[PDB]
Design a protein around this nucleic acid. Structure first.
Lengths: 61, 61, 61, 60, 62, 60
RNA sequence: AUUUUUG
């Protein structure tokens, strides 16, 4: 299970991740929480709740 | 459940959330009800029964 | 399950809903009958068997 | 289960149905077979095996 | 009752020229080498292609 | 099952895989690891955790 | 509502 380990890892190290969506949209932020379907991303201070079915790629720095 | 506890929060407080669809379009309204597949959003008097598969993110102004 | 309760209501009350597709297209008709995977709509005479995966939102007044 | 009741009468009566795809493109033909995921459509003279996930609506 | 695997089968053995249609509009021609629940392997321009079924719209011959 | 076989192979010898996304875009790299849903691809120095629902084709 | 038909 690479996913939970990766999300867990980001959440922990408070890594600034770039989330690429399927429609070409994107947000740079920090993964705060997450379950089987969503992912909570703190970006520019505002909280964004994201469905994984919309996410495409998670990229680091 | 990160999702459900978030969906209940908006629901309970009549919070004004912005819903972003996978097609870029966005809607603002209160979360009247929800379940495992859809979300009912009261917005501008009219009721919108929205499918989760068509949503990508939730946020507040 | 809010989805089914809302659809029987649209089916019973014989109310004219507007179906918004993911690609931006819209159709305004009446919800004949439905099931798990699809929805039969009587819009502009001819009938249409729509997949819920193509649907974004149901909008009533 | 309305999806099958619909896919049966189209096949049984060799009904000419219009298939609209998610991208808006539309095809015309007769449904010959179908299972859980795909549907075999004969259009003009060539067979097309189509995944339901690629379909938007059926119209007659 | 499962025509998907009945169709993917005849193709494989007869190495018949199949034309794959992607949802994104793309096209690819070739012979079905292998397949399963989630993917399909199509051999085209001397190259191998492992394709997700969720990206495919339709299969057509010739 | 061809998926896990192929995925494991590329991962075995760290092959040069070209991943095509549903939007036609492509990224060339080596499949580090993978699971039922995602795939970790190192390409151009960066590491990308990609969901299988977002991928279209793998090429060698 | 997270890898082939309420996606």
């Amino acid at each position: 299970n690479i996913q939970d380990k990766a999300l867990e890892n980001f959440k922990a190290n408070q890594t600034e991740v770039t989330v690429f969506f399927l429609n070409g949209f994107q947000m740079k932020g920090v993964i705060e929480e997450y379950d089987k379907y969503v992912v909570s991303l703190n970006s520019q201070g505002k909280q964004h709740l994201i469905y994984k079915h919309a996410i495409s790629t998670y990229t680091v720095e």
